[PDB]
Amino acid sequence: ERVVYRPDINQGNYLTANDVSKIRVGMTQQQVAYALGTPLMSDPFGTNTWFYVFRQQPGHEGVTQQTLTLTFNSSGVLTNIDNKPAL
Amino acid sequence: EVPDNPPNEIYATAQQKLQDGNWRQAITQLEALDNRYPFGPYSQQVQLDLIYAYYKNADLPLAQAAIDRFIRLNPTHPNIDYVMYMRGLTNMALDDSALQGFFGVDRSDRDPQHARAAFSDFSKLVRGYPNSQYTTDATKRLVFLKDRLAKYEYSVAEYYTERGAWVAVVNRVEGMLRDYPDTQATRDALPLMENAYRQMQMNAQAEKVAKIIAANSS
Amino acid sequence: FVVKDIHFEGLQRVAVGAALLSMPVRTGDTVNDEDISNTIRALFATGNFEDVRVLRDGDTLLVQVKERPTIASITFSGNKSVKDDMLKQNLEASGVRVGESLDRTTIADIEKGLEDFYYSVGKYSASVKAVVTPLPRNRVDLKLVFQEGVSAEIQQINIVGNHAFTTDELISHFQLRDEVPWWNVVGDRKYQKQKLAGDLETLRSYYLDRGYARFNIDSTQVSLTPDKKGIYVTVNITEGDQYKLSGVEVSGNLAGHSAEIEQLTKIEPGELYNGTKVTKMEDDIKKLLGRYGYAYPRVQSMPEINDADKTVKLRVNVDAGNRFYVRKIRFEGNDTSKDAVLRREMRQMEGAWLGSDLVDQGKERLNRLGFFETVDTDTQRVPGSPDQVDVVYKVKERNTGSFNFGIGYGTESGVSFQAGVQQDNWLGTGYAVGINGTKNDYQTYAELSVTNPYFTVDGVSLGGRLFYNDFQADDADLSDYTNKSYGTDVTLGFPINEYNSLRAGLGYVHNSLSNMQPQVAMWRYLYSMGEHPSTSDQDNSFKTDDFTFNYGWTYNKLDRGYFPTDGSRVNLTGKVTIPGSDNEYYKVTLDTATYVPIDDDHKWVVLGRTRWGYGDGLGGKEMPFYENFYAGGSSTVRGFQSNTIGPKAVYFPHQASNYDPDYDYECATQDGAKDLCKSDDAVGGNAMAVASLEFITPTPFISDKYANSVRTSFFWDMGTVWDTNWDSSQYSGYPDYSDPSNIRMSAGIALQWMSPLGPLVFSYAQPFKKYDGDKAEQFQFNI
Amino acid sequence: CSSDSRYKRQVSGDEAYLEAAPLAELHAPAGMILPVTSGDYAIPVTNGSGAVGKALDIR
Amino acid sequence: LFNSEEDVVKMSPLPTVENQFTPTTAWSTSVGSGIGNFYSNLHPALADNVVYAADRAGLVKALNADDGKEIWSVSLAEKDGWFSKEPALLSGGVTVSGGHVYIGSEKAQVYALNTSDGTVAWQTKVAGEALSRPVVSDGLVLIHTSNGQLQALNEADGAVKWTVNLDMPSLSLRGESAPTTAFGAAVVGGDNGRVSAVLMEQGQMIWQQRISQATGSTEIDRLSDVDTTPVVVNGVVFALAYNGNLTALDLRSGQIMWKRELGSVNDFIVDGNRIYLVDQNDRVMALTIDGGVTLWTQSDLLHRLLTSPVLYNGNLVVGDSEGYLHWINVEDGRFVAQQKVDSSGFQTEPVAADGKLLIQAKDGTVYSITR
C-alpha cells in the first residue's frame, strides 16, 4: 500500500497475564468463570473451548492478536490453556 | 366524526361504506357506534370491520390499535384468529415505508422490530388458533419471516466480515445458526464463521465447520 | 318476598344482567326489605346508576334507575394559555372523561384538581367550574369555565444563616430572579415551585465548590402572602465554615489503574473544598474505568470532614466492573437505512472491553451524519455474566428528499423549469445522492452528484459529478449568449485524520459557445485566450475543452450534521488546469463555518461563515469570466436579486447579435442602445470577499412539536467581489473594480423551517449599502 | 410508458411473504451439530390450512 | 392600544360612598414610603402622643402627635451587612415599651430602640423572621415567627429566655398569630387551622387545638388575612382558625365555647358582644360573643382590601389597601364619612390613639386622621 493515514481496528476479549495465573489446566469452567468470567466465544457444538481471542490492527502494517482458547473437557475440567499469539 | 344514527342505522351505515370501500366514512360510521354505543354488541364486529376498514384504508397502525382493542375487549373470541392474523399482517405491513422493495434494497437489511413482532403474532395465530383459515398463510408469512431476519442478520454478519472483528462474526453466524437452520444464508454464513476462524487461525475449528460445509454441501 | 323478575331501566353503561349481579334482589334470590335497600347502595356502587329506586310488585321487583354514564362531551372555556388536556388530565386523574359515568358530587373535586393544578402550575388566582350540561339518553357535557386572575410571582427571597454572600448576589447566580430595568433589559419573569428546588441545589453547589462542607439549608418559608401574588421567601441555611480539601484516601477495587485514578485525584491538599470537583473526579474514574471496560465503576467518595482545622480529607470507595462487557451490539430504527452503513459509523467493536467514549464517538459521527432526528441507543446490560452488554442502537432517523424551487411560469406556456432532488444518502445505503438540472426554452442542463462515502471502507467518498448544460438562451435561435457546456468531475475524499480529510478531483470543462455578447470583460478574457472576435456583434463562438485538476481539504471539528452548534469545519476547495487543457487557469476558494456559543444554552450561537477565493490564468491566460465569483440575493448575501456582487459588465457599441428581438433582449445593438450599454448584473470577479454573521434565535410562540429541528437567525450579509483583470483603462467610463472596496451590504433574518423534505430557508433582508448597480429583491426564499 | 422495469409498479414491498419458501438446512456431522432450532425463527408451525393472502376473509 | 393584551378576574370597587359627616386628616407627616408596596408585618405605634414612625428603609421617627413634628429620628439602615449600607427591612412592628422600641427586622434582628432618640438600646438576632408583631411583655419578647417559634427574649437586652417551635404551617402560610399574653398563658393561634394556649412563663403548651382547615391538602384562601392572633378576654379565648373560621374556646382546655366556623373572616375586633369584622368579600358584620350571632351586616365594602375595623369618632372606621377610608356606622353599616386621603392603600391598621387615627400606608405614609 501507499496511504499515509490509517485508523485502527480494535477488539479485546483477551486474557491478561494475571488471568492465566489465576487458572490452570484442570481448573473447571465455573472455577475459571469465577476468575475469568465467561468467554466471548466457546466451542459451540463440541467441548467447552473457551476462546478469549484478542484481535487488533495497529495501523498500516502489523497486526496484534492474542488468541487464547480454554479447552475444558466435557466434565468442565480444563484440558488446555492455549494462549496463542498473533497469526 | 360521529354521525349518530340509531345503532343499527349506524351499523348499516358502518357496513355500507365498507361495501363502498370508503373506509374513511366507514371508520367515521364505525366510530359512530363505538363512541355512542361501545356497549353495543357488534362493537366487537365493528372492531373487526374497522380492521377491514383501516388496513384497507392503509390505516395499519389504526388497525393495530383496533387489533389490540378487539384483543382487550375480547381476550376470548373466535374472530381473534382473524385479528391475530391481522396483527402480524399489520406488523409486517408496518415494515413497508419506501420503495426500496423494488430496488432490491428491500427491508431485510433494515429495522426488524415490527417484523419480529409480526413473527410473534403470525405464530400467535397458528399456535393460539390452529383451526383458522388464516393459519397456513401466517405460517407462509412466518416462512419468510425467519428469512427476512436471516439476510438482516447476514447483513450484520456481512458487516463484521467487512469490519474484520472475527470474534463477532462467529456470534452473528451463531445467532444465524441457533434460530434458523432452514435458511441457505446460514449455510452461506457457514463459510463466514469458518472464515472468521481462519482469520483468527482456527483452521481446524474452521475444518470442523468445513466438515459441516462438507455435510451441508448436501 | 321473592323476586320474580326485576325491571332494568336506564343504565347506559351497565348491562341488564350486569345490573342484576349488583342487585341483591337478583332474580331467584329471596328478597328482603334490607335487600331492597342493599340494592340501593350496591347499584349506587356500580358508579353508573344515578338514582336507584328499588320497588317490587308485591315481591315482583322493579328498580327505577336514572344513570351516570356517557359524558357525551367535555368543553373548556377561558383557558387561553393553558392546554385543556392538562385540565383534562386532572379530569383523567379524576377518572372522568368523555363517555364516562358523571357523578354530580365530584364536580368541585374536578375544580379542586383544576385549582390544585392552578395551585401547582404557578398560580392560585383562577377559578374553575365544571358546567354539567345534560344531553339525551342520560348524557352530559362537561363544560369547564376558567376565570384566570393571575399567576403567583416571586417577590423576595430572604436567606438567613448566609453571612459570606449577599442574598442579592445569591439571586444573580440563581434561577429565581427579578428586575427588568431600562438599564439592563432581560425580559419578563414569573414563579415556579420547581425553580425553588434547583435554586436550593444551585446554592448547595454554591457553597460546596467554595469549601463549605458544613453547609446546610435549615429550611425555607415561602410567604403565602395575603395578596395571592406575593411570593416572599424566607430561607434558613447554615453557612458551613469553609473546608480545605486536604487530601484523598482513594482505594477499593481500583482495577490496577490506581496511579491512573491518582492522576484524576491529583488535588491540592489544603485547597478550598470543591465537592463538585470531587463529584467529577469520581466520574473521571468512571470514564477511565468505563473506557477500561468497567461498565460498572462503583466509585463512592467520602469527605473526612475535619472541622478542627476546617479541612476535608477524602475517602473514595472505588469498585470497577468487568472489562469485556461489550459482548455484541444491536441496531434499530433503520428501516430505510442499511444497518452496516450505520454500523460502520461506530467505533466500539463487539468482542471487546468497553470503551466508554467509542459508543458516543460513533454516535458523534452519527451526530455528524445528520440524516437522523435522534441518534440514541439502548445499552442493554445482559445479565448472566459481566462480560455481557448488548447495546441496542435504536435511533430516530430523519426525513429524506430535498427539492430546490425556481420557475418562470409553466404548464400554461412553454415547459420551462428548474428542478432537482437530493436523496439524503439514498435509501440510507451509503449513497449520498444529490441531483439537479434544468431544461427550458432557454437551456438544457443536466447534472449529477453522487457520493458513495464507503465505496472503500477506509472512508473513500466515491464522489462522481458530471454535467451537460446546453444553455442556449434563445432570442429566436441562439443569438444571445448560447453555450453548450458539458463534462466530468469525479472526486474522491480520503481519511487524513478524524478531523482532517483532503479532497481531490479531475475536471473536464468542455464548453461550446456561440454569439458572444458585446460586454467588454468577456472579450478581454477572449483576448487573453488569443481570440479577437468582433466586439460590435455577437457572431462569436468559443469551443473550449478545459482539463482541470481539483483539490481541497475539509476540517472536521463541529457537533452535528443535523443541527450543528459548536466548533469549526474549515473546508478547502481549489482547482488548477493541466497540460492538455484548452485554457490554462487556476482557482482556489475559501469558506468557513465557525460555531461559537455566545449563549451556551445555544439559543444564541455565533455562526461564522465567510467566503474567499482567488483564481487567474495559469500562464498566458485568465481565469474564465464564468469562473469568476458572485454573491448577492440568491447567495449567502440576500435582500438583493441574483448576482449583484461582482464587477458590472458594459456592452461594446454593438450592431447585431445575429438576431436582435424587436426592442427586446437589448445588447447595445443597432436595434436599441446604439452606443456602449452598461449592465448592473454582476458579471463576476476573480476575487471573492463575502462575510455574513448568523446567530441562533429561539421561538417563543412556537411549540417544540416543531421548534426543535428548526432555527431562526439574524444576519448582516455584506460583501465585495472584484476582478483584478477588470482594469480602468477604458473601464474608467465603467464601474471600476480592482480592489476589495466594493462593499455591498444588506441585513436581515433567515427562517430555517424543516419541512418533510428537510430545511427550506426563507428570509427577509434589506440592503442599506449597495455597490455599483444592485438589483434588490428584499424578500428572499431559498432551500 | 416505455420502461425496462415496469414503470408504474415500483411500490413499497410485495407479496413475497406469500411467495415465501423454506431453504436448505443442517446436515452437519455429529458433535458438530448446533442447537439451530433454539431461536423461535425455526418457525413453530401448526396447520389447518384454509385460504391464503387476499383469499382470506375480512370480517 | 393596551386593550387586548392581558386578562384578570373580577374584583369589586367601593359602593355606597357617603361622607355626610366630613372626614379629613389631622396631618399627613408622611414618612417616605412606609411598609412599602412589598408585604411586611411591621406596623407603626402611636404612643405617648409621640408618633413612633419609621420605614423599612431605615429612617425611624418620633413625630409629634399634633402635627407630625419630628421629635427624634434615627436611621436603622444596616451599615455593615453584605451590601454596604443596606436598608432596615423591618419585619416586626413598632413596639414601644420602656426605653426600647422593639422592632423586628427582615435581617432576622429585633431592634429595641431607645424611645428617647431611637438609638438601638438593644438588638438581637431572631429565629426565622417575625411572622407576628413583637408582643413584648413580662420581660419576654413573644413572637410567633415564620418558623413558628415562640420566642421570649429578655427585653432589657434580648437575652433569649426560650425559643419554642409552635404551630408552624406547611409553608409560610401567612396569617399573623401574635402571641397575646393573657391569664398566665401564652395564647396564640395557628396557621395550620389551629389555635393554642401555651404557658406564658416558660413557653409550655397548655393545649393546641385544631379548629378548622388550612393550606396543604385542603387548598384554602391565600389572600385571606385571617387574624389568627387571639384577642384574649377571659377563659373563653376568642380566635380565628386559619381559613377565616372564628371560634370562642376554653383557655384552659381548648374546648369551644361558641364558634363561627364559617366564611373566611379576616380581621376581627371584639367590642364586647359587638364583633365587627372584615369578611372575604370585605362585608362588615356585627357578631356577638353569645355565639357569633349576627347583629348587623354591611357589604358596602365589597371586594376591597380592608384594614381592621375600629370605632373612632363615634363611627366604625375601616380603611383599605386602596387608600379609601370609610366611617361605617357602629350599627348597620352606614357610611357616615368616606375619606380618600390615600391612594397607595393602607396596608396597616388604624391607630385610634393619642387623640388621632394613625395609618402609615405603603406610600400614603403616616396619616393622622380626624373628621
Side-chain angles (χ1 to χ4, degrees):
Chain A
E1 66 98 23
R2 187 56 261 156
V3 184
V4 79
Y5 184 59
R6 182 65 185 90
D8 282 339
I9 297 179
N10 304 316
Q11 62 165 347
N13 185 31
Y14 42 88
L15 282 175
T16 76
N18 201 345
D19 280 348
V20 181
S21 62
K22 299 165 178 79
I23 67 156
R24 46 103 189 182
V25 161
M27 187 176 291
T28 74
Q29 309 179 245
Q30 308 87 17
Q31 278 156 231
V32 157
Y34 319 135
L36 312 188
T38 47
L40 303 187
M41 211 153 45
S42 195
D43 185 25
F45 38 72
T47 174
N48 320 333
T49 311
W50 279 11
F51 312 104
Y52 296 75
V53 184
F54 177 78
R55 295 300 319 260
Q56 201 274 324
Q57 171 253 350
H60 282 296
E61 257 297 309
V63 67
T64 45
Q65 149 186 5
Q66 186 38 66
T67 304
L68 203 154
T69 92
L70 286 178
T71 317
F72 307 91
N73 47 39
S74 63
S75 79
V77 157
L78 187 52
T79 58
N80 169 36
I81 301 170
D82 177 34
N83 186 40
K84 195 265 293 174
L87 308 182
Chain B
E1 300 185 15
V2 181
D4 183 35
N5 316 321
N8 49 337
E9 188 41 65
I10 284 169
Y11 175 69
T13 41
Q15 279 325 285
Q16 282 139 26
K17 267 89 77 184
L18 299 158
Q19 309 141 13
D20 309 342
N22 183 8
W23 327 109
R24 284 293 164 230
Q25 292 324 290
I27 290 145
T28 311
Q29 275 275 6
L30 292 147
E31 280 148 350
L33 188 88
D34 289 15
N35 303 310
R36 283 306 165 197
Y37 320 87
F39 50 86
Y42 45 79
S43 314
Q44 313 304 122
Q45 194 53 72
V46 157
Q47 282 307 307
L48 301 160
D49 276 305
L50 270 161
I51 303 160
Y52 168 46
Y54 285 135
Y55 198 101
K56 279 85 200 163
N57 216 348
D59 311 340
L60 330 165
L62 315 186
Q64 190 43 256
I67 279 144
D68 311 329
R69 267 170 271 162
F70 189 83
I71 288 165
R72 283 173 270 100
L73 291 151
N74 274 121
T76 79
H77 210 267
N79 298 340
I80 303 182
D81 46 23
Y82 162 80
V83 168
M84 199 37 77
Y85 182 71
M86 285 317 284
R87 189 165 222 280
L89 209 68
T90 288
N91 301 339
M92 64 90 77
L94 288 184
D95 205 5
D96 289 328
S97 44
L99 312 179
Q100 60 182 104
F102 182 75
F103 289 156
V105 197
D106 201 7
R107 287 153 273 260
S108 175
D109 48 339
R110 303 292 218 252
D111 172 73
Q113 57 198 358
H114 38 264
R116 299 186 258 90
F119 198 96
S120 59
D121 317 327
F122 282 142
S123 46
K124 275 200 305 295
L125 164 70
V126 312
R127 302 172 272 96
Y129 294 95
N131 47 0
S132 327
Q133 49 166 348
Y134 315 86
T135 293
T136 200
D137 198 9
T139 305
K140 173 54 64 198
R141 312 308 154 160
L142 281 148
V143 162
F144 208 91
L145 194 32
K146 62 153 178 59
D147 208 30
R148 196 266 178 215
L149 324 171
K151 305 174 281 171
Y152 171 66
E153 201 181 5
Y154 204 85
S155 71
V156 179
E158 283 158 15
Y159 164 71
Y160 285 103
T161 302
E162 309 139 17
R163 178 66 76 163
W166 308 112
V167 179
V169 185
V170 172
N171 319 333
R172 317 314 301 215
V173 175
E174 203 48 71
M176 278 200 77
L177 276 154
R178 296 309 172 77
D179 311 342
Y180 28 85
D182 51 337
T183 59
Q184 183 40 57
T186 312
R187 299 152 55 103
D188 306 337
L190 206 62
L192 266 298
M193 187 173 65
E194 167 167 353
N195 287 341
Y197 287 146
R198 303 156 316 108
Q199 282 109 40
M200 297 176 309
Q201 300 85 55
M202 300 182 189
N203 308 319
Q205 155 67 78
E207 272 158 11
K208 301 196 279 165
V209 188
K211 299 167 187 67
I212 300 161
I213 284 211
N216 287 319
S217 43
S218 165
Chain C
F1 300 92
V2 68
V3 50
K4 320 305 297 178
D5 54 344
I6 316 161
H7 295 65
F8 300 88
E9 58 187 1
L11 322 177
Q12 179 74 50
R13 195 83 44 82
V14 182
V16 159
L20 181 144
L21 62 97
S22 163
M23 300 213 196
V25 290
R26 49 178 74 91
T27 314
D29 184 33
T30 171
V31 165
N32 299 317
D33 299 330
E34 299 324 290
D35 274 4
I36 297 298
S37 56
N38 290 359
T39 315
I40 297 179
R41 49 98 195 164
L43 291 189
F44 277 155
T46 60
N48 293 256
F49 289 163
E50 201 163 337
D51 52 36
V52 175
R53 300 152 270 173
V54 193
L55 320 171
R56 58 196 179 193
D57 178 28
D59 52 341
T60 297
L61 263 289
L62 57 100
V63 185
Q64 305 170 354
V65 166
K66 206 257 158 196
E67 72 272 19
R68 263 78 64 89
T70 291
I71 296 153
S73 69
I74 294 165
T75 324
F76 301 86
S77 66
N79 51 2
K80 293 199 292 182
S81 303
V82 175
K83 300 297 182 290
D84 45 357
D85 188 34
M86 322 161 156
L87 303 162
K88 195 184 181 298
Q89 275 138 22
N90 298 113
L91 199 50
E92 283 153 287
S94 297
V96 189
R97 57 206 48 82
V98 168
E100 204 265 331
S101 43
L102 183 64
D103 190 16
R104 284 88 179 156
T105 77
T106 181
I107 302 176
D109 186 26
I110 299 152
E111 306 147 10
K112 184 74 178 299
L114 297 192
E115 275 316 305
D116 296 13
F117 157 73
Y118 276 146
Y119 197 86
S120 44
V121 71
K123 334 196 184 61
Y124 194 40
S125 317
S127 58
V128 282
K129 206 56 66 202
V131 196
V132 185
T133 320
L135 303 181
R137 310 178 297 156
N138 67 322
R139 286 167 310 202
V140 274
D141 159 70
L142 279 174
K143 188 211 163 305
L144 287 145
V145 68
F146 310 96
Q147 305 92 7
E148 316 207 28
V150 72
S151 161
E153 200 177 347
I154 52 178
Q155 309 302 300
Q156 177 261 357
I157 306 159
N158 194 6
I159 296 104
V160 299
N162 184 18
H163 315 301
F165 302 112
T166 314
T167 43
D168 312 332
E169 79 92 21
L170 284 201
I171 293 171
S172 60
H173 86 270
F174 275 165
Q175 313 143 8
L176 292 154
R177 286 182 196 170
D178 296 322
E179 198 40 73
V180 194
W182 323 126
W183 193 259
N184 184 254
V185 177
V186 285
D188 41 357
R189 86 294 197 283
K190 255 294 157 177
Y191 151 75
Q192 189 41 251
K193 64 195 64 51
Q194 277 64 237
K195 294 190 287 173
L196 320 176
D199 272 336
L200 296 172
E201 302 321 293
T202 315
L203 201 60
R204 177 64 50 175
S205 46
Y206 184 80
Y207 281 67
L208 175 65
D209 53 359
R210 308 293 156 81
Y212 309 92
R214 208 200 47 77
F215 169 64
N216 58 93
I217 300 158
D218 311 339
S219 74
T220 181
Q221 295 94 64
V222 45
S223 81
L224 265 66
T225 316
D227 45 13
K228 277 172 63 64
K229 194 176 178 293
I231 302 304
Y232 306 81
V233 193
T234 301
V235 194
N236 328 118
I237 68 122
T238 315
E239 176 189 347
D241 45 48
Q242 270 173 355
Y243 290 84
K244 277 78 192 148
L245 187 51
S246 41
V248 185
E249 294 288 322
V250 54
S251 68
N253 173 31
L254 298 170
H257 314 295
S258 304
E260 299 84 317
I261 290 151
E262 182 57 40
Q263 295 154 1
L264 320 160
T265 76
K266 293 284 102 176
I267 59 121
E268 163 191 354
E271 75 199 344
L272 269 176
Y273 187 41
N274 193 302
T276 66
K277 161 196 62 185
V278 164
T279 321
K280 294 185 287 285
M281 289 182 315
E282 292 180 285
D283 309 332
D284 296 351
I285 304 157
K286 291 158 189 308
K287 296 178 285 285
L288 176 134
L289 296 185
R291 86 214 178 196
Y292 290 163
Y294 313 112
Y296 298 109
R298 186 216 48 75
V299 183
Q300 180 46 62
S301 164
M302 191 273 283
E304 281 97 333
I305 304 181
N306 180 27
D307 310 337
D309 46 354
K310 295 303 174 185
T311 53
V312 279
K313 269 287 300 167
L314 203 72
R315 173 75 201 104
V316 171
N317 304 308
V318 186
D319 167 75
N322 198 289
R323 268 199 176 268
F324 309 109
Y325 271 98
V326 183
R327 216 178 41 181
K328 274 151 73 133
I329 61 176
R330 308 307 174 284
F331 264 60
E332 261 156 11
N334 42 358
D335 212 7
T336 320
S337 159
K338 199 189 177 294
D339 42 4
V341 188
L342 306 175
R343 279 184 183 274
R344 74 202 54 248
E345 215 164 9
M346 276 292 311
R347 278 302 288 172
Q348 172 58 59
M349 305 192 194
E350 321 185 315
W353 77 101
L354 172 73
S356 59
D357 40 358
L358 307 164
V359 44
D360 316 330
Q361 157 63 65
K363 279 199 288 194
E364 203 272 344
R365 301 157 66 188
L366 291 149
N367 289 135
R368 292 190 302 199
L369 166 78
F371 299 136
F372 69 103
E373 274 147 17
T374 82
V375 158
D376 55 297
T377 177
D378 159 66
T379 79
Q380 173 57 233
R381 167 60 190 144
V382 175
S385 175
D387 294 327
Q388 316 170 340
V389 163
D390 279 354
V391 191
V392 187
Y393 291 90
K394 174 51 198 62
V395 305
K396 178 60 194 77
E397 63 188 2
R398 218 183 39 86
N399 46 5
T400 191
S402 314
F403 196 82
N404 43 0
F405 71 102
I407 197 185
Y409 284 98
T411 324
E412 287 98 9
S413 51
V415 195
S416 278
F417 48 89
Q418 183 263 327
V421 190
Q422 291 79 238
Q423 296 326 291
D424 302 332
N425 189 24
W426 159 79
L427 288 179
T429 323
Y431 283 98
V433 174
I435 299 175
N436 59 90
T438 173
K439 203 269 162 192
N440 281 8
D441 51 349
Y442 217 71
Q443 75 269 10
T444 299
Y445 169 50
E447 199 264 358
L448 56 100
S449 313
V450 170
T451 290
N452 190 343
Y454 280 103
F455 160 69
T456 287
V457 191
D458 199 14
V460 174
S461 73
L462 200 60
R465 182 240 63 89
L466 318 178
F467 82 112
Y468 168 72
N469 187 11
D470 220 336
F471 177 73
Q472 306 300 285
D474 301 332
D475 293 0
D477 48 358
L478 61 101
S479 90
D480 268 356
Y481 45 103
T482 290
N483 177 34
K484 183 162 51 57
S485 41
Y486 43 99
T488 82
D489 201 346
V490 194
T491 44
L492 284 180
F494 302 130
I496 304 301
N497 287 81
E498 312 302 281
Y499 43 88
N500 288 343
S501 313
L502 271 76
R503 275 85 62 100
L506 283 175
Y508 184 89
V509 191
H510 205 153
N511 318 319
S512 299
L513 291 89
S514 43
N515 289 21
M516 295 182 87
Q517 283 284 139
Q519 44 199 359
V520 173
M522 163 185 293
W523 309 87
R524 63 150 161 81
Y525 169 67
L526 293 162
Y527 305 150
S528 52
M529 281 323 285
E531 294 189 356
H532 279 69
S534 88
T535 80
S536 202
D537 284 300
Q538 315 180 32
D539 42 353
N540 320 109
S541 198
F542 195 31
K543 308 313 190 202
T544 177
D545 183 19
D546 304 339
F547 291 78
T548 79
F549 163 68
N550 320 94
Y551 49 89
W553 157 77
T554 173
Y555 195 44
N556 193 5
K557 187 199 69 176
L558 178 46
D559 303 336
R560 197 170 299 115
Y562 156 67
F563 216 100
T565 315
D566 202 350
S568 295
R569 289 201 197 109
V570 177
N571 318 309
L572 172 64
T573 78
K575 70 157 165 56
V576 286
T577 56
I578 67 174
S581 197
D582 288 14
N583 186 13
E584 285 326 291
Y585 51 87
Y586 68 98
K587 174 157 56 182
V588 305
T589 305
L590 290 80
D591 316 302
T592 54
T594 71
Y595 280 65
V596 193
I598 44 177
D599 166 47
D600 301 1
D601 301 332
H602 302 338
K603 304 161 291 182
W604 297 271
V605 166
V606 189
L607 308 172
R609 196 275 315 155
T610 55
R611 266 194 274 167
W612 324 103
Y614 187 78
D616 208 356
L618 203 66
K621 307 296 197 168
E622 295 172 5
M623 192 178 63
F625 45 82
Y626 49 86
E627 302 186 3
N628 291 357
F629 297 107
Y630 315 89
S634 48
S635 67
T636 78
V637 174
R638 58 202 38 82
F640 297 92
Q641 299 187 0
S642 315
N643 281 5
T644 60
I645 303 195
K648 305 299 180 164
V650 186
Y651 300 119
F652 269 116
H654 175 260
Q655 317 308 308
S657 312
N658 302 158
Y659 163 67
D660 305 319
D662 306 286
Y663 286 83
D664 163 44
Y665 285 97
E666 296 90 342
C667 44
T669 172
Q670 195 47 70
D671 312 339
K674 190 42 218 286
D675 275 329
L676 288 143
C677 163
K678 48 187 63 181
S679 64
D680 59 350
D681 195 11
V683 68
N686 59 12
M688 194 165 55
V690 181
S692 193
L693 266 301
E694 305 271 359
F695 297 105
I696 298 192
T697 302
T699 59
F701 292 136
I702 292 186
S703 73
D704 213 356
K705 167 190 164 317
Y706 44 93
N708 48 6
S709 78
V710 311
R711 73 214 93 187
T712 58
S713 199
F714 307 93
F715 46 86
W716 174 279
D717 44 349
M718 49 91 64
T720 295
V721 167
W722 84 97
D723 209 308
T724 56
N725 323 120
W726 184 270
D727 313 326
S728 192
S729 44
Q730 46 94 52
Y731 315 82
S732 42
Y734 318 155
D736 269 323
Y737 292 8
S738 285
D739 287 83
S741 159
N742 312 123
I743 299 172
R744 281 90 176 181
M745 188 260 298
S746 65
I749 187 194
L751 323 170
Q752 180 257 304
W753 148 250
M754 186 150 310
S755 86
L757 281 200
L760 320 178
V761 287
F762 279 20
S763 65
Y764 166 66
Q766 183 163 1
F768 286 111
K769 158 71 148 164
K770 310 162 71 64
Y771 209 96
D772 266 316
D774 302 341
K775 317 152 288 297
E777 186 41 71
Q778 295 208 354
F779 296 154
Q780 289 297 99
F781 324 112
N782 310 312
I783 299 296
Chain D
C1 317
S2 158
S3 87
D4 189 81
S5 298
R6 188 49 259 164
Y7 81 101
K8 254 282 197 166
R9 306 279 86 79
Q10 278 84 13
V11 307
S12 191
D14 297 85
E15 213 59 38
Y17 269 78
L18 193 42
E19 306 147 31
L23 305 98
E25 52 95 27
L26 185 143
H27 324 306
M32 317 199 166
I33 297 180
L34 309 99
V36 282
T37 178
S38 38
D40 67 328
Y41 308 126
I43 310 172
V45 168
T46 75
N47 212 357
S49 198
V52 285
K54 276 85 176 176
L56 276 173
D57 301 336
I58 39 201
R59 64 207 64 177
Chain E
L1 182 54
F2 290 88
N3 45 3
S4 315
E5 317 178 359
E6 288 98 8
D7 162 69
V8 202
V9 81
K10 191 254 174 173
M11 182 261 287
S12 155
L14 177 61
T16 323
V17 185
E18 316 261 352
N19 45 358
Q20 313 94 322
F21 202 86
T22 167
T24 176
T25 178
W27 62 94
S28 280
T29 171
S30 293
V31 184
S33 177
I35 318 295
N37 284 170
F38 91 107
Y39 175 59
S40 179
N41 56 285
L42 165 73
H43 165 76
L46 182 45
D48 319 330
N49 275 111
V50 172
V51 187
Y52 284 107
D55 46 11
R56 81 277 175 272
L59 272 303
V60 174
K61 308 306 189 189
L63 300 156
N64 177 25
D66 201 12
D67 43 349
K69 173 260 297 175
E70 198 70 79
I71 301 167
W72 52 251
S73 276
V74 281
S75 189
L76 298 190
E78 266 91 20
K79 262 75 64 179
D80 43 354
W82 305 302
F83 54 103
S84 278
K85 280 80 179 173
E86 320 178 345
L89 299 186
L90 308 171
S91 52
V94 180
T95 301
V96 186
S97 155
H100 291 130
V101 179
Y102 308 94
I103 298 179
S105 67
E106 308 151 15
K107 312 304 198 304
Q109 313 298 293
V110 44
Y111 284 13
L113 323 168
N114 203 357
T115 80
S116 46
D117 43 3
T119 59
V120 199
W122 66 257
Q123 61 193 3
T124 308
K125 180 158 203 59
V126 317
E129 293 292 346
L131 204 150
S132 310
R133 199 182 197 192
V135 198
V136 185
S137 45
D138 297 333
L140 324 163
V141 180
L142 298 95
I143 304 181
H144 148 79
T145 52
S146 50
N147 41 356
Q149 320 300 307
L150 171 62
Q151 278 88 340
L153 273 63
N154 185 20
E155 70 171 89
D157 60 340
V160 190
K161 295 180 177 174
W162 62 94
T163 289
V164 173
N165 173 246
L166 296 195
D167 180 289
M168 181 199 172
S170 54
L171 298 174
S172 157
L173 276 56
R174 276 298 324 190
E176 179 143 337
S177 67
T180 42
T181 308
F183 322 119
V187 197
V188 61
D191 297 333
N192 287 307
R194 319 199 304 192
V195 75
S196 65
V198 195
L199 189 74
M200 166 255 279
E201 288 80 352
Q202 206 54 48
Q204 315 304 310
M205 183 70 78
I206 300 182
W207 45 268
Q208 172 103 47
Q209 208 69 59
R210 168 60 173 250
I211 306 301
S212 305
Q213 313 315 109
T215 323
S217 89
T218 306
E219 282 180 13
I220 63 130
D221 302 331
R222 186 158 101 90
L223 176 49
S224 206
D225 54 323
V226 182
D227 197 19
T228 49
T229 296
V231 298
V232 196
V233 69
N234 53 3
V236 180
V237 161
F238 296 87
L240 273 154
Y242 183 63
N243 55 341
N245 282 20
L246 159 66
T247 180
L249 86 171
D250 176 42
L251 163 66
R252 290 88 193 265
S253 68
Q255 293 319 298
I256 312 297
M257 321 294 276
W258 59 262
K259 43 171 56 189
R260 287 296 100 186
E261 309 296 314
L262 57 90
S264 165
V265 193
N266 304 305
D267 276 334
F268 82 115
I269 56 181
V270 182
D271 302 341
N273 62 314
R274 308 300 316 262
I275 300 195
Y276 305 109
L277 61 98
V278 171
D279 202 77
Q280 195 76 4
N281 68 315
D282 305 72
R283 175 194 51 86
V284 192
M285 183 162 66
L287 309 187
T288 56
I289 59 187
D290 322 316
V293 191
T294 286
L295 306 158
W296 57 261
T297 291
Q298 171 215 45
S299 182
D300 303 333
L301 295 151
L302 183 62
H303 306 155
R304 325 297 328 291
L305 194 48
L306 291 181
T307 75
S308 278
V310 50
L311 183 70
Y312 181 67
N313 310 321
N315 264 299
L316 203 59
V317 199
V318 198
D320 57 18
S321 278
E322 281 100 0
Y324 297 84
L325 285 156
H326 325 83
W327 275 256
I328 310 303
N329 189 10
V330 48
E331 201 58 34
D332 186 80
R334 305 283 71 73
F335 274 62
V336 189
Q338 204 283 302
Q339 183 49 65
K340 196 49 172 158
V341 81
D342 178 26
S343 306
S344 87
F346 313 113
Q347 193 179 352
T348 50
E349 328 299 308
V351 192
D354 291 337
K356 313 301 166 154
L357 187 71
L358 205 83
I359 305 181
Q360 174 155 33
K362 313 173 186 57
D363 206 5
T365 43
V366 178
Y367 281 159
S368 59
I369 300 303
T370 177
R371 291 175 81 182

